[PDB]
Amino acid sequence: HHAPSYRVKRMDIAKNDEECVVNAAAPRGLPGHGVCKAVYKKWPESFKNSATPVGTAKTVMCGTYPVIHAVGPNFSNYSESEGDRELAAAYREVAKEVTRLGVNSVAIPLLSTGVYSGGKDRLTQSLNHLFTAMDSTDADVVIYCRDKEWEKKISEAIQMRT
Numbered sequence: 399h400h401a402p403s404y405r406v407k408r409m410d411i412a413k414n415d416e417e418c419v420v421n422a423a424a425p426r427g428l429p430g431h432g433v434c435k436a437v438y439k440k441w442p443e444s445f446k447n448s449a450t451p452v453g454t455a456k457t458v459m460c461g462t463y464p465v466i467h468a469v470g471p472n473f474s475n476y477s478e479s480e481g482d483r484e485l486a487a488a489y490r491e492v493a494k495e496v497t498r499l500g501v502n503s504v505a506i507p508l509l510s511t512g513v514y515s516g517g518k519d520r521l522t523q524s525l526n527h528l529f530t531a532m533d534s535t536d537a538d539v540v541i542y543c544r545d546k547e548w549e550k551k552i553s554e555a556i557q558m559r560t
């Protein structure tokens with residue numbers, strides 16, 4: 399009867415201590431910048447047939463270590479309304495994969511808040527879709543970020559639900 403938790407760490411998600419990692423991926427499975435750059439360097443064999451549509455997630459093992467490639471929408475291409483819908487869906491597919499895998503913990507970034515943000519601050523939008531998807535899972539969730547201001551805000555949001 400463990401107590402599932404949420405935690406935030408400001409560090410490279412490729413150095414995570416969890417049983418699986420979520421990549422903020424691209425639909426064509428191509429190595430990119432940001433999270434996907436780190437994931438490619440650490441777990442390159444997980445990019446075999448990782449391409450998957452926007453709003454979906456696809457898991458590929460690197461050894462026995464699962465890499466969940468989740469494809470958030472690029473807000474430069476989507477309307478705010480359609481993009482918000484795809485971002486919610488991507489996180490829902492992450493939650494299903496985490497559950498299917500049976501892991502006790504997952505390392506997860508904030509999808510569509512960097513290269514795919516359309517130039518907007520989407521910290522709150524993306525974190526809330528994360529919570530909406532993962533709340534009903536019983537995995538320990540650890541959110542990885544790089545920005546000191548964002549660590550604080552993510553940590554505040556976690557605190558004020560406990």
Ligand SMILES: Nc1ncnc2c1ncn2[C@@H]1O[C@H](COP(=O)(O)OP(=O)(O)OC[C@H]2O[C@H](O)[C@H](O)[C@@H]2O)[C@@H](O)[C@H]1O
Pocket residue numbers: 409410411412422423424425428429430431432433434435436470507508509510511512513514515542543544545
């Ligand atoms: N190694 C890292 N660890 C933790 N957080 C990171 C890391 N790197 C960046 N962040 C932050 O994690 C957050 C997500 O930023 P992004 O990785 O761009 O994801 P997206 O969904 O918006 O863009 C995906 C596209 O860009 C890629 O090229 C893909 O291949 C795709 O083509 C930001 O706040 C980062 O500051």
